[PDB]
Each structure stands twice: as structure tokens, then as C-alpha cells.
Short mmCIF file of C-alpha atoms in Angstrom, two decimals:
data_model
loop_
_atom_site.label_atom_id
_atom_site.label_comp_id
_atom_site.label_asym_id
_atom_site.label_seq_id
_atom_site.Cartn_x
_atom_site.Cartn_y
_atom_site.Cartn_z
CA UNK I 1 55.68 89.40 57.86
CA UNK I 2 58.77 87.44 59.03
CA UNK I 3 58.86 87.06 62.87
CA UNK I 4 61.80 89.03 64.34
CA UNK I 5 61.49 92.61 65.62
CA UNK I 6 64.07 95.28 64.74
CA UNK I 7 64.82 96.37 68.30
CA UNK I 8 65.54 92.88 69.62
CA UNK I 9 69.16 91.83 70.10
CA UNK I 10 70.50 89.60 67.31
CA UNK I 11 73.22 87.17 66.31
CA UNK I 12 75.21 87.92 63.17
CA UNK I 13 75.83 84.68 61.29
CA UNK I 14 78.57 84.74 58.68
CA UNK I 15 78.16 82.70 55.48
CA UNK I 16 81.91 82.14 55.48
CA UNK I 17 82.33 79.07 57.68
CA UNK I 18 79.11 79.57 59.60
CA UNK I 19 80.62 81.61 62.43
CA UNK I 20 78.60 83.96 64.61
CA UNK I 21 80.21 87.36 65.14
CA UNK I 22 81.53 87.51 68.72
CA UNK I 23 82.51 90.53 70.78
CA UNK I 24 84.70 89.77 73.79
CA UNK I 25 84.68 91.71 77.11
CA UNK I 26 88.30 92.73 76.58
CA UNK I 27 87.47 94.23 73.19
CA UNK I 28 88.59 91.20 71.16
CA UNK I 29 86.57 90.49 68.01
CA UNK I 30 86.15 87.14 66.25
CA UNK I 31 83.64 84.43 65.39
CA UNK I 32 82.41 81.16 66.89
CA UNK I 33 79.93 78.45 65.97
CA UNK I 34 78.42 77.80 69.40
CA UNK I 35 75.02 79.51 69.41
CA UNK I 36 75.01 79.38 73.21
CA UNK I 37 78.08 81.63 73.46
CA UNK I 38 76.92 84.68 75.45
CA UNK I 39 79.23 87.11 73.61
CA UNK I 40 77.43 86.85 70.28
CA UNK I 41 74.18 88.49 71.37
CA UNK I 42 74.46 91.89 69.66
CA UNK I 43 72.39 95.07 69.63
CA UNK I 44 72.13 96.95 66.33
CA UNK I 45 71.15 100.59 66.49
CA UNK I 46 70.58 102.95 63.59
CA UNK I 47 72.48 106.23 64.06
CA UNK I 48 70.94 107.54 60.85
CA UNK I 49 69.38 105.98 57.74
CA UNK I 50 71.20 102.86 56.62
CA UNK I 51 73.93 103.41 59.22
CA UNK I 52 74.28 101.42 62.45
CA UNK I 53 76.40 100.60 65.47
CA UNK I 54 76.87 97.02 66.65
CA UNK I 55 77.12 96.52 70.39
CA UNK I 56 78.13 93.25 71.99
CA UNK I 57 75.56 93.10 74.78
CA UNK I 58 77.72 91.18 77.25
CA UNK I 59 81.05 92.78 76.36
CA UNK I 60 79.15 96.08 76.58
CA UNK I 61 81.46 97.26 73.80
CA UNK I 62 80.87 98.56 70.27
CA UNK I 63 82.24 96.92 67.16
CA UNK I 64 84.80 99.16 65.51
CA UNK I 65 87.22 99.07 62.60
CA UNK I 66 90.55 100.84 63.11
CA UNK I 67 92.69 102.71 60.56
CA UNK I 68 94.62 99.56 59.61
CA UNK I 69 91.47 97.53 59.01
CA UNK I 70 91.68 95.59 62.26
CA UNK I 71 88.43 94.85 64.12
CA UNK I 72 87.92 95.40 67.84
CA UNK I 73 85.28 96.42 70.38
CA UNK I 74 85.59 99.71 72.25
CA UNK I 75 83.84 100.61 75.50
CA UNK I 76 83.13 104.06 74.10
CA UNK I 77 81.38 104.88 70.81
CA UNK I 78 83.63 106.64 68.33
CA UNK I 79 83.27 107.47 64.63
CA UNK I 80 84.79 104.08 63.77
CA UNK I 81 81.81 102.27 65.30
CA UNK I 82 79.43 103.02 62.43
CA UNK I 83 78.74 100.81 59.42
CA UNK I 84 76.47 101.06 56.40
CA UNK I 85 74.06 98.16 56.70
CA UNK I 86 72.99 96.80 53.36
CA UNK I 87 70.65 93.94 52.49
CA UNK I 88 72.27 92.59 49.34
CA UNK I 89 70.38 91.11 46.39
CA UNK I 90 71.39 87.67 47.70
CA UNK I 91 69.50 88.39 50.94
CA UNK I 92 72.53 88.60 53.22
CA UNK I 93 73.64 91.77 54.99
CA UNK I 94 76.99 93.54 54.66
CA UNK I 95 78.50 96.05 57.04
CA UNK I 96 80.74 98.59 55.37
CA UNK I 97 82.70 101.01 57.57
CA UNK I 98 81.39 104.54 57.30
CA UNK I 99 84.82 105.92 58.13
CA UNK I 100 86.88 103.62 55.87
CA UNK I 101 84.34 103.38 53.04
CA UNK I 102 85.78 100.39 51.18
CA UNK I 103 86.28 98.07 54.11
CA UNK I 104 83.74 95.51 55.25
CA UNK I 105 83.21 93.75 58.56
CA UNK I 106 84.10 90.13 57.80
CA UNK I 107 85.37 86.81 59.09
CA UNK I 108 88.08 84.53 57.72
CA UNK I 109 87.07 80.88 57.15
CA UNK I 110 89.23 80.22 60.22
CA UNK I 111 86.94 82.05 62.61
CA UNK I 112 89.23 85.06 62.91
CA UNK I 113 88.17 88.39 61.46
CA UNK I 114 89.49 89.60 58.12
CA UNK I 115 91.26 92.95 57.73
CA UNK I 116 88.96 95.54 56.18
CA UNK I 117 91.78 96.31 53.78
CA UNK I 118 91.48 92.73 52.49
CA UNK I 119 87.71 92.65 51.93
CA UNK I 120 85.61 93.26 48.84
CA UNK I 121 81.94 93.29 47.70
CA UNK I 122 82.15 89.97 45.91
CA UNK I 123 83.71 88.21 48.90
CA UNK I 124 81.94 85.62 51.04
CA UNK I 125 83.66 86.70 54.26
CA UNK I 126 81.54 89.87 54.36
CA UNK I 127 78.13 88.13 54.18
CA UNK I 128 76.06 88.04 57.37
CA UNK I 129 72.57 86.76 58.05
CA UNK I 130 70.94 88.40 61.10
CA UNK I 131 69.28 85.90 63.42
CA UNK I 132 67.24 85.92 66.61
CA UNK I 133 68.91 85.65 70.01
CA UNK I 134 66.88 82.47 70.83
CA UNK R 1 92.84 47.21 50.57
CA UNK R 2 89.33 46.86 52.07
CA UNK R 3 88.50 49.43 54.77
CA UNK R 4 85.62 50.96 56.69
CA UNK R 5 84.05 54.28 55.60
CA UNK R 6 85.82 57.53 56.30
CA UNK R 7 85.41 61.23 55.54
CA UNK R 8 87.66 62.27 52.65
CA UNK R 9 87.21 66.00 53.13
CA UNK R 10 86.39 66.99 56.68
CA UNK R 11 87.13 70.60 55.72
CA UNK R 12 83.88 70.83 53.75
CA UNK R 13 82.06 69.45 56.84
CA UNK R 14 83.31 71.74 59.64
CA UNK R 15 80.37 74.17 59.24
CA UNK R 16 77.66 72.23 61.12
CA UNK R 17 74.97 74.91 61.33
CA UNK R 18 73.74 76.13 57.93
CA UNK R 19 71.61 79.25 58.26
CA UNK R 20 70.49 80.61 54.90
CA UNK R 21 68.00 83.22 53.63
CA UNK R 22 64.79 81.54 52.44
CA UNK R 23 64.44 80.64 48.77
CA UNK R 24 68.06 79.60 48.48
CA UNK R 25 69.45 76.19 47.59
CA UNK R 26 71.17 74.19 50.31
CA UNK R 27 73.69 71.45 49.54
CA UNK R 28 74.86 69.22 52.37
CA UNK R 29 78.00 67.22 51.72
CA UNK R 30 79.70 64.27 53.37
CA UNK R 31 82.56 63.24 51.03
CA UNK R 32 83.39 59.64 51.83
CA UNK R 33 85.70 56.78 50.90
CA UNK R 34 86.23 53.15 51.86
CA UNK R 35 86.44 49.72 50.24
CA UNK R 36 84.00 48.46 49.25
CA UNK R 37 82.32 51.74 48.22
CA UNK R 38 80.20 52.73 51.20
CA UNK R 39 76.51 53.56 50.72
CA UNK R 40 74.76 56.71 51.84
CA UNK R 41 71.47 57.57 53.49
CA UNK R 42 70.10 60.91 54.68
CA UNK R 43 67.99 61.48 57.74
CA UNK R 44 65.85 64.43 58.71
CA UNK R 45 65.60 64.61 62.48
CA UNK R 46 66.84 61.04 62.89
CA UNK R 47 64.15 59.59 60.63
CA UNK R 48 64.20 58.58 56.96
CA UNK R 49 64.08 61.64 54.67
CA UNK R 50 61.46 61.05 51.94
CA UNK R 51 60.67 63.12 48.87
CA UNK R 52 57.24 63.91 50.32
CA UNK R 53 58.68 65.46 53.50
CA UNK R 54 58.95 68.77 51.66
CA UNK R 55 57.28 70.24 48.59
CA UNK R 56 59.50 69.55 45.60
CA UNK R 57 61.43 66.94 47.52
CA UNK R 58 65.20 66.96 47.27
CA UNK R 59 67.99 65.72 45.00
CA UNK R 60 71.06 63.65 45.74
CA UNK R 61 74.25 63.56 43.72
CA UNK R 62 75.88 60.29 44.87
CA UNK R 63 79.06 61.19 43.00
CA UNK R 64 79.59 64.11 45.39
CA UNK R 65 78.01 62.61 48.51
CA UNK R 66 75.65 65.56 48.63
CA UNK R 67 72.05 66.33 49.55
CA UNK R 68 70.36 69.13 47.65
CA UNK R 69 67.27 71.09 48.70
CA UNK R 70 66.09 73.89 46.40
CA UNK R 71 64.21 77.02 47.38
CA UNK R 72 64.34 76.31 51.12
CA UNK R 73 61.64 77.59 53.47
CA UNK R 74 61.28 77.89 57.27
CA UNK R 75 59.67 74.45 57.62
CA UNK R 76 62.91 72.89 56.29
CA UNK R 77 64.53 73.81 59.58
CA UNK R 78 65.83 70.72 61.36
CA UNK R 79 68.68 68.24 61.55
CA UNK R 80 70.00 66.45 58.48
CA UNK R 81 72.19 63.42 59.00
CA UNK R 82 74.22 61.55 56.47
CA UNK R 83 74.82 57.89 57.22
CA UNK R 84 77.66 56.22 55.31
CA UNK R 85 78.54 52.54 55.60
CA UNK R 86 80.02 49.27 54.32
CA UNK R 87 80.70 45.88 55.94
CA UNK R 88 83.58 47.29 57.97
CA UNK R 89 81.75 50.18 59.61
CA UNK R 90 79.17 52.94 59.75
CA UNK R 91 79.73 56.63 60.40
CA UNK R 92 77.42 59.65 60.44
CA UNK R 93 77.54 63.45 60.55
CA UNK R 94 74.72 65.87 61.32
CA UNK R 95 74.03 69.33 59.96
CA UNK R 96 71.47 71.75 61.33
CA UNK R 97 69.49 73.79 58.82
CA UNK R 98 67.90 77.12 59.69
CA UNK R 99 65.97 79.33 57.25
CA UNK R 100 65.55 83.09 57.60
CA UNK R 101 63.09 85.13 55.57
CA UNK R 102 64.26 88.50 54.40
CA UNK R 103 61.81 91.37 53.96
CA UNK R 104 63.39 93.86 51.52
CA UNK R 105 61.09 96.87 52.06
CA UNK R 106 61.42 100.45 53.24
CA UNK R 107 60.10 100.78 56.84
CA UNK R 108 56.36 100.23 57.35
CA UNK R 109 54.37 102.01 60.10
CA UNK R 110 51.09 100.95 61.68
CA UNK R 111 48.04 102.74 60.27
CA UNK R 112 46.57 105.25 62.68
CA UNK R 113 49.76 105.93 64.63
CA UNK R 114 50.72 108.39 65.64
CA UNK R 115 47.16 109.37 66.58
CA UNK R 116 45.81 112.93 66.76
CA UNK R 117 45.86 114.34 70.28
CA UNK R 118 44.00 117.04 72.17
CA UNK R 119 44.63 118.74 75.52
CA UNK R 120 44.23 121.96 77.49
CA UNK R 121 47.41 123.94 78.14
CA UNK R 122 49.56 122.52 80.92
CA UNK R 123 48.42 119.02 80.08
CA UNK R 124 50.56 116.01 79.18
CA UNK R 125 50.38 114.13 75.88
CA UNK R 126 52.08 111.36 73.89
CA UNK R 127 52.40 109.97 70.38
CA UNK R 128 53.09 106.29 69.74
CA UNK R 129 54.63 104.89 66.59
CA UNK R 130 54.89 101.22 65.64
CA UNK R 131 57.51 100.38 63.03
CA UNK R 132 58.40 97.16 61.26
CA UNK R 133 61.52 96.67 59.11
CA UNK R 134 64.09 94.01 58.29
CA UNK R 135 67.04 96.24 57.46
CA UNK R 136 67.74 98.28 60.63
CA UNK R 137 65.37 101.30 60.68
CA UNK R 138 66.17 104.82 61.83
CA UNK R 139 63.33 106.59 63.63
CA UNK R 140 63.03 110.25 64.53
CA UNK R 141 60.16 112.47 65.60
CA UNK R 142 59.64 115.74 63.81
CA UNK R 143 57.40 118.72 64.56
CA UNK R 144 56.35 121.02 61.74
CA UNK R 145 57.31 124.62 62.53
CA UNK R 146 58.64 123.00 55.16
CA UNK R 147 60.03 124.19 58.51
CA UNK R 148 60.88 120.98 60.42
CA UNK R 149 62.35 120.39 63.89
CA UNK R 150 63.88 117.13 65.07
CA UNK R 151 62.56 116.51 68.57
CA UNK R 152 64.03 113.04 68.97
CA UNK R 153 66.23 110.77 66.85
CA UNK R 154 67.32 107.17 67.38
CA UNK R 155 70.99 106.49 68.02
CA UNK R 156 73.49 105.14 70.54
CA UNK R 157 72.19 107.77 72.96
CA UNK R 158 68.50 107.42 72.09
CA UNK R 159 67.91 103.67 71.80
CA UNK R 160 65.03 102.17 69.82
CA UNK R 161 63.93 100.83 73.21
CA UNK R 162 62.13 104.10 73.88
CA UNK R 163 62.21 105.98 70.55
CA UNK R 164 58.80 104.63 69.48
CA UNK R 165 56.92 106.73 72.01
CA UNK R 166 57.11 110.55 72.25
CA UNK R 167 56.07 112.42 75.40
CA UNK R 168 55.33 116.10 75.87
CA UNK R 169 54.83 117.23 79.48
CA UNK R 170 53.13 120.51 80.47
CA UNK R 171 52.25 121.20 76.86
CA UNK R 172 51.83 124.84 75.83
CA UNK R 173 50.06 126.62 72.96
CA UNK R 174 53.52 126.53 71.39
CA UNK R 175 53.49 122.71 71.37
CA UNK R 176 50.34 122.54 69.24
CA UNK R 177 50.81 121.54 65.61
CA UNK R 178 51.69 118.57 63.39
CA UNK R 179 53.95 115.83 64.75
CA UNK R 180 55.53 113.23 62.48
CA UNK R 181 57.16 109.87 63.02
CA UNK R 182 59.67 109.21 60.27
CA UNK R 183 61.33 105.84 59.75
CA UNK R 184 63.93 105.08 57.15
CA UNK R 185 66.35 102.36 56.08
CA UNK R 186 68.74 101.74 53.19
CA UNK R 187 65.80 100.93 50.93
CA UNK R 188 63.60 103.94 51.67
CA UNK R 189 61.73 106.28 53.99
CA UNK R 190 58.21 106.30 55.46
CA UNK R 191 56.30 108.54 57.88
CA UNK R 192 52.95 109.12 59.56
CA UNK R 193 51.77 112.51 60.91
CA UNK R 194 49.40 113.31 63.78
CA UNK R 195 48.03 116.58 65.06
CA UNK R 196 48.27 117.96 68.58
CA UNK R 197 45.54 120.42 69.54
CA UNK R 198 46.00 122.56 72.64
CA UNK R 199 42.88 124.09 74.24
CA UNK R 200 42.51 126.97 76.70
#
């Protein structure tokens, strides 16, 4: 079986541009390419089958997608901090908001996130490859 | 107008680290220009990259200044450098390749766990459960009372960090019965049951 263990913290690498998902201490959400960045070590936790929360370890905040589709990290877990985790046929993972069921966690090729309202299944901005935290 | 080599599309080169799921094709590009037409070489970890360095070798489409590796595997991990040059200069760019193997299966538990347990009333007891899964798994412990009762369930408040082990202090004749560790992910569900026997 492949190395990694499910409870270990991970980095979420985005096919689009090769940015790692980063969660800032002030709740800001974006992506970077520097693997050493301390705000990209995340902790995934299943709340129920196929559904998870994504916590930026350092920022000690949870990834969340607001009503408008904007992405941010809140100190307190709410119902907007849950995403359906799916391992697509292409072997990448997608994180679809459980609250706003058609919006995906994603990153623009610029390194900035992409509004959930502007994402779609066929897109490349929504594809993430989970990786070890070194 | 004779000039040294230069990158004609730095946009396609910004993404330095290429992490892809195993079995996929990787194409590294270094679009160049310069007069005369610069040549191109590829290095793997600073050394010449030969067809025998990986099963199946690789392909190169000079026309697109690209390096192509099909069905990548973990051992392909490493640095790939393109070296372009002509009589007026030499420039290089390095990409890092990282391969990740996916494991598309429903959760798998270790045979034998949780194990059956025995104890006299008032005694302490535990059930361990080892789970392996790629997609994030959801684990919960259930007691049969099919009348089922969730004793513990993973979540933001009950981290995986300690969800794999279930303790029962000062057990009573009530506690006896069949305990189950159930793990599930988007693909499917799996579970192993153990039996707790309480003695007088």
C-alpha cells in the first residue's frame, strides 16, 4: 500500500499552477508554491462518510466557503466548513461544499482562490493531490 | 539578428514543482528561441538523462521544447533540467517531479482487530482498530443493543488521533456484547466486530 497515513497532516497541491492550498492566521485563504511555507500543513478530518473539514494547522482555522462563494478560514467550525471529498477517476481529489452543493474549493492559476460560484466539475482549478507534510 | 537563447513562454514554466498521481504522463516544457536555433538537453538530477534511466524511457518533441515521460512512477521523482544553448549563451530551468500513488478502495481494517475481550464486572477494557484508506475515512464505534448504538464517532470534536482506540472503564454486565469498528469513505464501508464478555 502507498506510504501516507490518513490521520497525518497533509498538503493540498492544486493541479492548476502547482499551488499548495494555504490557510493564513488571519483567516485569509490562497495558494503558494513554497513547500516550506508553514501555513500549508493541513489536517483533514472526516465528519461523516465522504465529508471532511480542512484545518490549517498553524492558522488553527478551518477552511470555509461563504454564501457568495468566497473562501476563508474561520477560528470556529460552522456548517460551511464541510466538503465532500471525492477521489476522481483521474486520481485527483475535489472538495465540494456540503452547504453550497455546486461549488468547489479551487485556486485560480494566479495563486488566488476561485469563487465557488465560478467552479465546475470539468475545471482544473478544483483538482487537488494530497501530499505528505515532509 | 543573431542572439543568445531565451525563453519564449515563461508562463508555461512558472509551475516548477510537478506533483502528479502515478501512472500519468508528464510533459516538461521550456519553449525557447534564439539565432542560431539553440539546442536542447535534459538532465535528471544534474546528470545526463538516458533512455535506460527509467523503464520505457522518455520521448522528446523538439518542435515544442518538451520532455515526455509516460506512466510515471514514484522512482521518477527528482529534478529535471532543460539546458538550451547556442554560441551566444546557455540558459537552464529546473522542474521537480513528484509522484503520488492513489489507492481507490473502501477503507480496509487490520484482521483480528478489534479483538474479543473478557473481564469481571468493574474491570477496564479496550478495543483497538487499525484502518488504512486513501480517501479520508470516517470511523465510529458501535455497540449492538439490528439495534445499534454509536458510542464514538470521528469528527472535529473526536479527532482520528484517538478514535482508533475505544476504552470502557468500570465495565458492567450491561457493557457486555458485540462491539464494532466501522470505517467508511466515499467509495464504501467496512467493519470488524469483537465481543466483550463480562464475568462475575
